[PDB]
CSV table of C-alpha atoms in Angstrom, one decimal:
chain,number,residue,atom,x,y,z
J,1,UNK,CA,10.6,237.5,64.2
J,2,UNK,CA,14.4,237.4,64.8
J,3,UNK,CA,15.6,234.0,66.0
J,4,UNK,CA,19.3,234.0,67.1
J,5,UNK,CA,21.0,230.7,67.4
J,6,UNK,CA,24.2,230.0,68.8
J,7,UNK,CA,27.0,226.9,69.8
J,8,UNK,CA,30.2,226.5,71.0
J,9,UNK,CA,30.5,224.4,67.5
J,10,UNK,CA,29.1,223.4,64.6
J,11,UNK,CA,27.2,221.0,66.1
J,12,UNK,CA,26.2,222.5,68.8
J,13,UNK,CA,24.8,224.9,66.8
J,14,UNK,CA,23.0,222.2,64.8
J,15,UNK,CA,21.6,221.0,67.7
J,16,UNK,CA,20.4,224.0,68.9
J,17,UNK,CA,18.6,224.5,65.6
J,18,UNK,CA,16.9,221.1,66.3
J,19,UNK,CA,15.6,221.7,69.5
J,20,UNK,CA,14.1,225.2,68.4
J,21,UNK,CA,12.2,223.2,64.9
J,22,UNK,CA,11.1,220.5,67.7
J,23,UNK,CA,10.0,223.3,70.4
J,24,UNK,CA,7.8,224.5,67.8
J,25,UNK,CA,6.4,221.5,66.7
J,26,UNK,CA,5.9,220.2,70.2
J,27,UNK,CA,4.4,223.7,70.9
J,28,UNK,CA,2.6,225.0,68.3
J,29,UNK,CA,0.2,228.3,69.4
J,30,UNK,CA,3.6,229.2,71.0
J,31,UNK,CA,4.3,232.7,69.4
J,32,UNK,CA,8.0,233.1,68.3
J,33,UNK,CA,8.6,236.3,69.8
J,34,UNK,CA,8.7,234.7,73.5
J,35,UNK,CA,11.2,231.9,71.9
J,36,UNK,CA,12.8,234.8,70.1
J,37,UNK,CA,13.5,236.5,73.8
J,38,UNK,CA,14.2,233.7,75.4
J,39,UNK,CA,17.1,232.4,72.7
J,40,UNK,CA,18.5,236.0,73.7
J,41,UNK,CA,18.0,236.3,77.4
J,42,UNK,CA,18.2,232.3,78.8
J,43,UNK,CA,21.3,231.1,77.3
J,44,UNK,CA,25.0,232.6,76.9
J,45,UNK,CA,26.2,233.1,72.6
J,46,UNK,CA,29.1,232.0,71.4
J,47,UNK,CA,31.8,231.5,68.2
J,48,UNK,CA,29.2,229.8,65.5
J,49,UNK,CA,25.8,231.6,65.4
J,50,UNK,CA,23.3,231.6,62.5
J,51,UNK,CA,19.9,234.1,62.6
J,52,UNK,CA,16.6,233.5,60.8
J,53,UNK,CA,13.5,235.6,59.8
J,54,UNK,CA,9.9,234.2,59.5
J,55,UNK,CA,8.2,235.2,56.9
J,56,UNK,CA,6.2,232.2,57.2
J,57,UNK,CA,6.4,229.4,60.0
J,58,UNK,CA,7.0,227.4,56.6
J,59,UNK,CA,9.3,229.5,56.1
J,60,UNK,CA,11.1,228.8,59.6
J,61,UNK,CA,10.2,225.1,60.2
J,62,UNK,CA,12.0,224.8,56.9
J,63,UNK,CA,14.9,227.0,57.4
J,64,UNK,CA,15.9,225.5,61.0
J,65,UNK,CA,15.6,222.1,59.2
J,66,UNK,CA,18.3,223.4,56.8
J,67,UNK,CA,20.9,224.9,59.3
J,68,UNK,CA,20.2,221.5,61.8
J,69,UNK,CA,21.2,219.5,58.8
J,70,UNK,CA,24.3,222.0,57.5
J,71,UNK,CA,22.9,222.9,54.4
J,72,UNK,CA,22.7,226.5,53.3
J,73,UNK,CA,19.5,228.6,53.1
J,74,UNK,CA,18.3,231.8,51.9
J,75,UNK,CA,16.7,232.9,55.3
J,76,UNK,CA,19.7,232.3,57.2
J,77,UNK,CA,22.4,234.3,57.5
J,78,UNK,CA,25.7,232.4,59.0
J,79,UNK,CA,28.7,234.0,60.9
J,80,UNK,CA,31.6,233.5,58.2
J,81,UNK,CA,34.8,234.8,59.1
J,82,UNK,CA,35.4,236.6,62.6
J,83,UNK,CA,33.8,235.7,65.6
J,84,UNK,CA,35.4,237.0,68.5
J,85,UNK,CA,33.6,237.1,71.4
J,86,UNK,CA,34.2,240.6,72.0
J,87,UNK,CA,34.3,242.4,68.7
J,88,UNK,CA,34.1,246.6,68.7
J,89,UNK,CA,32.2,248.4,66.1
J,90,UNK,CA,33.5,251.6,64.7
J,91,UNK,CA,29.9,253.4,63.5
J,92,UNK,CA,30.3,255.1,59.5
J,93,UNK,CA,28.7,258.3,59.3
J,94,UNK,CA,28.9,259.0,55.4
J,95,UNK,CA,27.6,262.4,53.6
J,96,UNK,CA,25.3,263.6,51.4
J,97,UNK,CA,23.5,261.2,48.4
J,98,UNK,CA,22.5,258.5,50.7
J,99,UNK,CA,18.8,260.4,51.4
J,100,UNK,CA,15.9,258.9,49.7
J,101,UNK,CA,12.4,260.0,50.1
J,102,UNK,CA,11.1,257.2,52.0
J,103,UNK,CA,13.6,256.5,53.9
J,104,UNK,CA,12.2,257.4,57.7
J,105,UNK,CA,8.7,256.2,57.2
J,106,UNK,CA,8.5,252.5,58.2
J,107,UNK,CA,11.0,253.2,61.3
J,108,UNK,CA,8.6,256.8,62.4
J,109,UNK,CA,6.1,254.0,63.4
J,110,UNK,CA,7.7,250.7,64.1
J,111,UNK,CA,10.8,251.9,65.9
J,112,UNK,CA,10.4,253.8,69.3
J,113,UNK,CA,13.9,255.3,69.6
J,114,UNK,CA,14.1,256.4,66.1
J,115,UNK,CA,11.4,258.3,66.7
J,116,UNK,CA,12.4,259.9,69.5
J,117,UNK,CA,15.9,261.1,68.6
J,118,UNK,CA,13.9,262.5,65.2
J,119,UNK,CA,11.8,264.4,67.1
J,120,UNK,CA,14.5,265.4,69.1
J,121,UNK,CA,16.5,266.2,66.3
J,122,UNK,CA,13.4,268.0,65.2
J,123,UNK,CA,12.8,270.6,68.1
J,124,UNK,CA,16.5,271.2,68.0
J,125,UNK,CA,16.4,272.2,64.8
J,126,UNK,CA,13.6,274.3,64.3
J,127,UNK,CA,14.8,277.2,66.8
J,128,UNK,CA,17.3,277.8,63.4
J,129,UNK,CA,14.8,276.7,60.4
J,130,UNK,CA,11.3,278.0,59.8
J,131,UNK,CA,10.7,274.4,58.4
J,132,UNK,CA,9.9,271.1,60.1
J,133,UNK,CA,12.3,267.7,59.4
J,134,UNK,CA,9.7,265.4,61.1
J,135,UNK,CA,7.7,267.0,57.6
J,136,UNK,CA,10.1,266.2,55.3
J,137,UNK,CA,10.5,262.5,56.9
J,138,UNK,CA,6.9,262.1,56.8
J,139,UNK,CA,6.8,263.3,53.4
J,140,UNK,CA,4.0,265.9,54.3
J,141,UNK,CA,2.8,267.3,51.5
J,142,UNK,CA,3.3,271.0,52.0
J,143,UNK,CA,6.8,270.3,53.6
J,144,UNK,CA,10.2,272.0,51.3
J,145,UNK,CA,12.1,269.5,49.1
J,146,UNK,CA,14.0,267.3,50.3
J,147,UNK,CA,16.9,267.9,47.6
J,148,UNK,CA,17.5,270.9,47.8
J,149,UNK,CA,20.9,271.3,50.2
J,150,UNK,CA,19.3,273.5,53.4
J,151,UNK,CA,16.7,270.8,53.5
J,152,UNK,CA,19.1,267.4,53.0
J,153,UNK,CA,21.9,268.0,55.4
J,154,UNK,CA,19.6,268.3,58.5
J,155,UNK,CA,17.4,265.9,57.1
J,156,UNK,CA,20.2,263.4,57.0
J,157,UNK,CA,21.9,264.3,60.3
J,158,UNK,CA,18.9,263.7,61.5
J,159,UNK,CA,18.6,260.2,60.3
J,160,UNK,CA,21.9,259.4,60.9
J,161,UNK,CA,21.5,260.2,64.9
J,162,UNK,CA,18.4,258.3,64.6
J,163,UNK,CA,19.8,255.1,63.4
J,164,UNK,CA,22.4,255.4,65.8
J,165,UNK,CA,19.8,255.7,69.0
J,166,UNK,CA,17.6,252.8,67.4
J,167,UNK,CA,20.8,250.5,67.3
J,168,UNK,CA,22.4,251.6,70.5
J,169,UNK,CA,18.6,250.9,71.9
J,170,UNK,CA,18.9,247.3,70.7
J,171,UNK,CA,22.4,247.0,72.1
J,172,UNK,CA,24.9,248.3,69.5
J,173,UNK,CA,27.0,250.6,70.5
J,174,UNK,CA,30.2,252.6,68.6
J,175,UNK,CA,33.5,251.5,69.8
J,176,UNK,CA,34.6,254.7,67.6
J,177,UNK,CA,33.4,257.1,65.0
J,178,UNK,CA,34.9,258.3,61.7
J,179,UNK,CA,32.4,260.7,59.4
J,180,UNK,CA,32.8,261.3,55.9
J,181,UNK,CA,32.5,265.1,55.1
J,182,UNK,CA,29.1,266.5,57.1
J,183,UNK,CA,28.4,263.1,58.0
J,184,UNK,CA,31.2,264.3,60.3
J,185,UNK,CA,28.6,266.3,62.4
J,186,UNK,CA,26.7,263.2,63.0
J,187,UNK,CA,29.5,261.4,64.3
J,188,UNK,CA,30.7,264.4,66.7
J,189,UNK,CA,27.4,264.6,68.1
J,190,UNK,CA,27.3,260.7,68.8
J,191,UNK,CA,30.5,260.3,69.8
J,192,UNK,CA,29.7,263.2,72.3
J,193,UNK,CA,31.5,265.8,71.1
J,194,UNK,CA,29.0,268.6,70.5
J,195,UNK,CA,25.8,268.8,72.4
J,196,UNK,CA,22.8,268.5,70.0
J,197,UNK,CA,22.7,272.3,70.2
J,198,UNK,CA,25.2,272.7,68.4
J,199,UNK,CA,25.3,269.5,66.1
J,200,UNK,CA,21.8,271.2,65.0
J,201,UNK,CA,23.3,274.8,65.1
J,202,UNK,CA,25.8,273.6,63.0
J,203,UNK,CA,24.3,271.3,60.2
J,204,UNK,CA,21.4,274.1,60.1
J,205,UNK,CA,24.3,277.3,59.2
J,206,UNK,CA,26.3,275.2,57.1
J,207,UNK,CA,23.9,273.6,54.5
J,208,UNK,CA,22.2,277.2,54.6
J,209,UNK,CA,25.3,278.9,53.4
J,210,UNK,CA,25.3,276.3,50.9
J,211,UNK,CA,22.0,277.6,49.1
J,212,UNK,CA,24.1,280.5,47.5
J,213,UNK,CA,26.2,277.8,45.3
J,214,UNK,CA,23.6,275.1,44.9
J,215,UNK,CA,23.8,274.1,41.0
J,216,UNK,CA,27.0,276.0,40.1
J,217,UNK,CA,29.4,273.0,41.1
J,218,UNK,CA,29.4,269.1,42.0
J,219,UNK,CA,31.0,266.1,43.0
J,220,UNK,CA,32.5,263.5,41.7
J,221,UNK,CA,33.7,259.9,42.6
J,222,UNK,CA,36.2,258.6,40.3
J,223,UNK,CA,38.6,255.3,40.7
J,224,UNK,CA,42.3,256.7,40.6
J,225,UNK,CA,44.7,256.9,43.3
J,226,UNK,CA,44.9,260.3,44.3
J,227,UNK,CA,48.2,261.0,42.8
J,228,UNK,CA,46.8,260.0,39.3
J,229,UNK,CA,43.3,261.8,39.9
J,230,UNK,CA,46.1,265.4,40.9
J,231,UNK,CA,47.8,264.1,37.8
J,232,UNK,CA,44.5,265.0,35.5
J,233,UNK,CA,42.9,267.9,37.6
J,234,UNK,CA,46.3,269.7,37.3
J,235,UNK,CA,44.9,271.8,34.4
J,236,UNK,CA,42.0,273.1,35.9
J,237,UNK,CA,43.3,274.3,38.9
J,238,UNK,CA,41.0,276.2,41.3
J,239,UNK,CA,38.1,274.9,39.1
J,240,UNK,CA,38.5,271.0,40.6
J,241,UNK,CA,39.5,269.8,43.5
J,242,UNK,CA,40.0,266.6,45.4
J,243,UNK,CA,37.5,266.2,47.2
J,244,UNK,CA,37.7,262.8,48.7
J,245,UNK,CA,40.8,260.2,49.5
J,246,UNK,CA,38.5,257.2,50.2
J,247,UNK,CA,40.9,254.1,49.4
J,248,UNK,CA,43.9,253.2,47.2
J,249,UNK,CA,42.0,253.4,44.0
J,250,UNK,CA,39.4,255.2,44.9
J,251,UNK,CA,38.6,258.8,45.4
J,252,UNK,CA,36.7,261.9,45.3
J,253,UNK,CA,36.7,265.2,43.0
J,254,UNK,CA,34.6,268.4,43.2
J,255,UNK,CA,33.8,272.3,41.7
J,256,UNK,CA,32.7,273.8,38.7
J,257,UNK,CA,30.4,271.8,36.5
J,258,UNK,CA,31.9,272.5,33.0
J,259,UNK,CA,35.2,271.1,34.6
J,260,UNK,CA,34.0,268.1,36.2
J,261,UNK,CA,32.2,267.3,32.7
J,262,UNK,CA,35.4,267.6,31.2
J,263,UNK,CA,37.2,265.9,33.0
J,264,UNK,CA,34.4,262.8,33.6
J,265,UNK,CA,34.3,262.8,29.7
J,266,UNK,CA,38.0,262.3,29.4
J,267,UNK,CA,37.9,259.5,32.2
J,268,UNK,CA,35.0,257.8,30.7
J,269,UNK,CA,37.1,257.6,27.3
J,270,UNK,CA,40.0,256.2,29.1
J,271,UNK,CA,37.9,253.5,30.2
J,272,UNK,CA,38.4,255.0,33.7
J,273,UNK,CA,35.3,255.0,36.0
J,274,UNK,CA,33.7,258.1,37.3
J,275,UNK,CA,30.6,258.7,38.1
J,276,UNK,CA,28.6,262.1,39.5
J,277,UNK,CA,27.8,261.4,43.3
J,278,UNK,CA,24.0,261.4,42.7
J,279,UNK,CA,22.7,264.1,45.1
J,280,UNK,CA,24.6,266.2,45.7
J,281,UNK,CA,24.7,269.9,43.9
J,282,UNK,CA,27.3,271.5,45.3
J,283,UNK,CA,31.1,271.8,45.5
J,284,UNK,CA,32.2,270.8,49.3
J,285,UNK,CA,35.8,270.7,49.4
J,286,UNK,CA,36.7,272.8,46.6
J,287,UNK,CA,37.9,276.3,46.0
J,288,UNK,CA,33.8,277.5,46.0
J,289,UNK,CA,34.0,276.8,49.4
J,290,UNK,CA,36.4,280.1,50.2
J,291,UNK,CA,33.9,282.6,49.2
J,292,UNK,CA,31.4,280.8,52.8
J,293,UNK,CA,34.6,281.3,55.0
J,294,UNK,CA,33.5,284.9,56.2
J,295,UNK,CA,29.4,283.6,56.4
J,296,UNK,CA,30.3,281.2,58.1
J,297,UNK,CA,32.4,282.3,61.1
J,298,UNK,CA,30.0,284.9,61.5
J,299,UNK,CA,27.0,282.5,62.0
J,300,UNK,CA,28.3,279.8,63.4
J,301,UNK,CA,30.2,280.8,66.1
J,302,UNK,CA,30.7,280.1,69.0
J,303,UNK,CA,30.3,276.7,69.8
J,304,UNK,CA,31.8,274.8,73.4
J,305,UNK,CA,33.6,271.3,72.1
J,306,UNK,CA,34.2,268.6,74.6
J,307,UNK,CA,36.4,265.6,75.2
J,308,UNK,CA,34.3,262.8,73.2
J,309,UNK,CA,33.1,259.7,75.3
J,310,UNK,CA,34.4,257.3,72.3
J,311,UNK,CA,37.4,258.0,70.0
J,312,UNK,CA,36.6,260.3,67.0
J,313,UNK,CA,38.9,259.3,63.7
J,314,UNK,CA,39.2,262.9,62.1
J,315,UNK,CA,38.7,262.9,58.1
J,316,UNK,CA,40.2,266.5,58.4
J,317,UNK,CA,43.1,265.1,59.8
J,318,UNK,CA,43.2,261.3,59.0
J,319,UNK,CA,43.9,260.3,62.5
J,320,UNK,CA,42.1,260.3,66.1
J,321,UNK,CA,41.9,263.9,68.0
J,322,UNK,CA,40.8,265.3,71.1
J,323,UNK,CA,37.2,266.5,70.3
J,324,UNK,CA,38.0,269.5,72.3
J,325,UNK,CA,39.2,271.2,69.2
J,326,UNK,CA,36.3,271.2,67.2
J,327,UNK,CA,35.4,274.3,66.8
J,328,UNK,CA,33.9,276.9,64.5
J,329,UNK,CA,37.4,276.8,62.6
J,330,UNK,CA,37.3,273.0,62.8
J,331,UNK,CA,33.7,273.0,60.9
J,332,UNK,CA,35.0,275.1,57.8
J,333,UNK,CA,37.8,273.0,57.6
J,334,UNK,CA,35.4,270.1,57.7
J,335,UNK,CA,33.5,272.1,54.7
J,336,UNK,CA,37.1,273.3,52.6
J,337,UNK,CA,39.7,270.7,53.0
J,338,UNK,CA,40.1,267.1,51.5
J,339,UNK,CA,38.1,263.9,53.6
J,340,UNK,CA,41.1,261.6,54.7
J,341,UNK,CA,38.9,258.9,54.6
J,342,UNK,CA,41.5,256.6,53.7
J,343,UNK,CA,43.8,257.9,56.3
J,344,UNK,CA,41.2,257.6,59.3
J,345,UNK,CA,40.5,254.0,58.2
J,346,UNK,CA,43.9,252.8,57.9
J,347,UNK,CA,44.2,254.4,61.5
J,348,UNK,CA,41.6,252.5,62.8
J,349,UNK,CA,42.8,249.5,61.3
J,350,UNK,CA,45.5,249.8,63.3
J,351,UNK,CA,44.1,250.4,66.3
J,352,UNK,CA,42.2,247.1,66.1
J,353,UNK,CA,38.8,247.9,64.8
J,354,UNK,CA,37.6,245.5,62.2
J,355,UNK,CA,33.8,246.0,62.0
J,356,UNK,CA,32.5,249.0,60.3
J,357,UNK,CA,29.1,250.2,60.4
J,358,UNK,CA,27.6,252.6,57.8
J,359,UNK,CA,24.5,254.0,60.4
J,360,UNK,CA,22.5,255.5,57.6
J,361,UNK,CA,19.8,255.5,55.1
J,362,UNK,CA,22.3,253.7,51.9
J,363,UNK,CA,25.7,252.6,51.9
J,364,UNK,CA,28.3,255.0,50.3
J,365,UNK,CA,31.4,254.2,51.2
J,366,UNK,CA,31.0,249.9,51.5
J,367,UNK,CA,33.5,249.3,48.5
J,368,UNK,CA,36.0,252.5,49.5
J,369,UNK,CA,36.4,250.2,52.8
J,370,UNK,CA,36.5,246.7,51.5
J,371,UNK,CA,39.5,248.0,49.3
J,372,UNK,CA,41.0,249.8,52.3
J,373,UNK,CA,41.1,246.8,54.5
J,374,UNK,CA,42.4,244.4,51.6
J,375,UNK,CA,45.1,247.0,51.2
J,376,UNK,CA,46.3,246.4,55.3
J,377,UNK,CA,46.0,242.6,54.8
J,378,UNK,CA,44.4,242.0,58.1
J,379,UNK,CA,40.9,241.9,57.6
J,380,UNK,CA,37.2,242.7,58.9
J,381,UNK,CA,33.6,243.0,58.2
J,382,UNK,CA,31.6,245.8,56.7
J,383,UNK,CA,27.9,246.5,57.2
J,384,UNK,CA,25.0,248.5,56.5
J,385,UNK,CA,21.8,249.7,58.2
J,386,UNK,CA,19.1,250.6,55.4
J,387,UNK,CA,19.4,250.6,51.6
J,388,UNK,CA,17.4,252.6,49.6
J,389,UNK,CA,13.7,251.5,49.2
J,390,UNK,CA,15.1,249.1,52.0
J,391,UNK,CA,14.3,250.9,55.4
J,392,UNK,CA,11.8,248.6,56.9
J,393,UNK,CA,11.3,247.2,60.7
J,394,UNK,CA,11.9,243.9,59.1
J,395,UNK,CA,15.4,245.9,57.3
J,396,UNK,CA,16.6,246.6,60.5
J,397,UNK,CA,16.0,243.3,61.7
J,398,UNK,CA,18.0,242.0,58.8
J,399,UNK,CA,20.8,244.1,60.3
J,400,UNK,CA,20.4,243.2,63.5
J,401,UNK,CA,20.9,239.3,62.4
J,402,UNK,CA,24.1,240.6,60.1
J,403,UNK,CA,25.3,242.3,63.7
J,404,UNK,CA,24.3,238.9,65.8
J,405,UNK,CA,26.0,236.8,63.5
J,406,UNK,CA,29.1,239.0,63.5
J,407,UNK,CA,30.0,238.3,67.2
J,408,UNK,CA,27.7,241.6,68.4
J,409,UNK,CA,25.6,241.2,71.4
J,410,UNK,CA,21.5,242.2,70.8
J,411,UNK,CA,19.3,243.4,73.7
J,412,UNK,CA,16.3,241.0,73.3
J,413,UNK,CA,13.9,243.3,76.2
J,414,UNK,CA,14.3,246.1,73.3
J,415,UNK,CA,13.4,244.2,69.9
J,416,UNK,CA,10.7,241.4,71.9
């Protein structure tokens, strides 16, 4: 059960940790769930908050000792750094290599609105696939793999919508979106840019175009500046590309497979670090991607863009945009040209936001960010929602308390 504690200070807090050990002892029988909704729903939260989870009233009785006497515990997770009341929450959306196989099973059952925005998701999709995503999700056994790249990208939309509903459900809501490369679909759609006609329409067209290149390219992350990562790829021309500005330091390259192998071997004998993006068998954002440009348009067209209801941080163009614009033309951009992740973030950063959010199945782009906010001095907090072989109820709840303790505000009629 999540228990969230708050003061006004330190002690406060201590105290409140006190009474809670004390109301359980003077009421044992008394199931932690109705003290878990009343923590939330009886009582205002303030700047110093701590959050626990029971794996065993041991477990708790112990732990609320521990934070009532100022002493750190594994079980409880402490707000360290900002705390303002009112803190926004811009929701990550990253791409491709995050899926694992797992990854929807525990929340199919346990969460309500994950399920629902999956099967959503699901009808959606289906008027475009002859293949089920609620299949793949539930690992059925006669369901197509979930590697290969028609299968993954709606797969993965779809989980990426469904975190978002299960958070906003248990009151956590984007403040703003910025997608990395498809994940920029996701964010459209839950920003409220595309309907989830087209989101689907889209995701659906795209990663099918993809199956005609699957396996004769890649992607690579590699830690260079981008100036020095143009430096090396200079050679190759068409045959790499940069795929990916993600932070000072860090960054992204991608197309044919005998180049990247070059070019990793040379980086790994410099001592540099590269690494293939695990998952991931195509080229996006490379010169491959030319040959889709006529597919596309004729497939996926037309589709009706509308003003978002929260601010959308293009990675096509590094900086916020009128949703209006994204169109057909908008989503081959999104597939050929380079992800101004760095851009968009430094944007953000700027614009005040200071909690990211990766709302999906494993964290990507966690370090990419960290370095980006170092880089701006001012700083803020990064997050995740599942890891892989880490997508349980109990996960989530982990998430939740990382959210609580982080100055967001949980809807305790949703998780009690």
């Amino acid at each position: 059960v999540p228990l969230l504690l708050s003061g006004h200070t330190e002690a406060a807090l201590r105290e409140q940790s006190t009474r809670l050990l004390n109301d359980l002892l003077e009421h044992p029988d008394e199931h932690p769930a109705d003290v878990g909704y009343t923590l939330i729903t009886g009582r205002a939260h303030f700047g110093h908050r701590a959050a626990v989870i029971g794996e065993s009233r041991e477990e708790l009785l112990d732990a609320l000792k521990a934070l009532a006497e100022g002493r750190e515990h594994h079980t409880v997770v402490r707000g360290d750094g900002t705390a303002h009341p009112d803190r926004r929450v811009v929701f990550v959306f990253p791409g491709q290599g995050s899926q694992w196989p797992s990854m929807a099973r525990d929340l199919l059952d346990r969460a309500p609105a994950f399920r629902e925005t999956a099967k959503a998701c699901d009808a959606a999709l289906s008027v475009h696939l002859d293949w089920s995503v609620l299949d793949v999700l539930q690992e059925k056994p006669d369901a197509p793999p979930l590697s290969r790249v028609d299968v993954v990208q709606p797969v993965l939309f779809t989980m990426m919508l469904s975190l978002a509903a299960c958070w906003r459900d248990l009151g956590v809501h984007p403040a703003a979106v910025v997608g990395h490369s498809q994940g920029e679909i996701a964010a459209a759609c839950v920003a409220g840019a595309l309907s989830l006609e087209d989101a689907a329409r889209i995701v659906a067209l795209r990663s099918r175009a993809w199956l005609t290149l699957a396996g004769k390219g890649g992607m690579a992350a590699v830690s260079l500046p981008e100036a020095r990562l143009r430096e090396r790829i200079e050679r190759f021309g068409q045959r790499l590309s940069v795929a990916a500005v993600n932070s000072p330091g860090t960054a992204a390259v991608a197309g044919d497979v005998d180049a990247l192998r070059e070019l990793l071997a040379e980086l790994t004998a410099e001592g540099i670090r590269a690494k293939p993006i695990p998952g991931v068998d195509t080229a996006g954002h490379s010169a491959q991607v030319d040959g889709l440009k006529e597919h596309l348009f004729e497939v996926l067209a037309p589709v009706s863009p509308r003003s978002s209801d929260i601010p959308f941080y293009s990675t096509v163009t590094g900086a916020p945009l009128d949703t209006e614009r994204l169109d057909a033309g908008y989503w081959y951009r999104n597939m050929r040209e380079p992800v101004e992740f760095e851009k968009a973030v430094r944007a953000l950063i700027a614009d005040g936001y200071d909690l990211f959010l990766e709302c999906n199945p494993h964290p990507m782009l966690a370090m990419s960010l960290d370095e980006t906010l170092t880089d701006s001095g001012g700083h803020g907090t990064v997050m995740h929602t599942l890891r892989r072989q880490k997508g349980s109820a109990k996960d989530f709840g982990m998430a939740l308390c990382l959210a609580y303790v982080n100055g967001l505000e949980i809807d305790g009629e949703a998780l009690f």
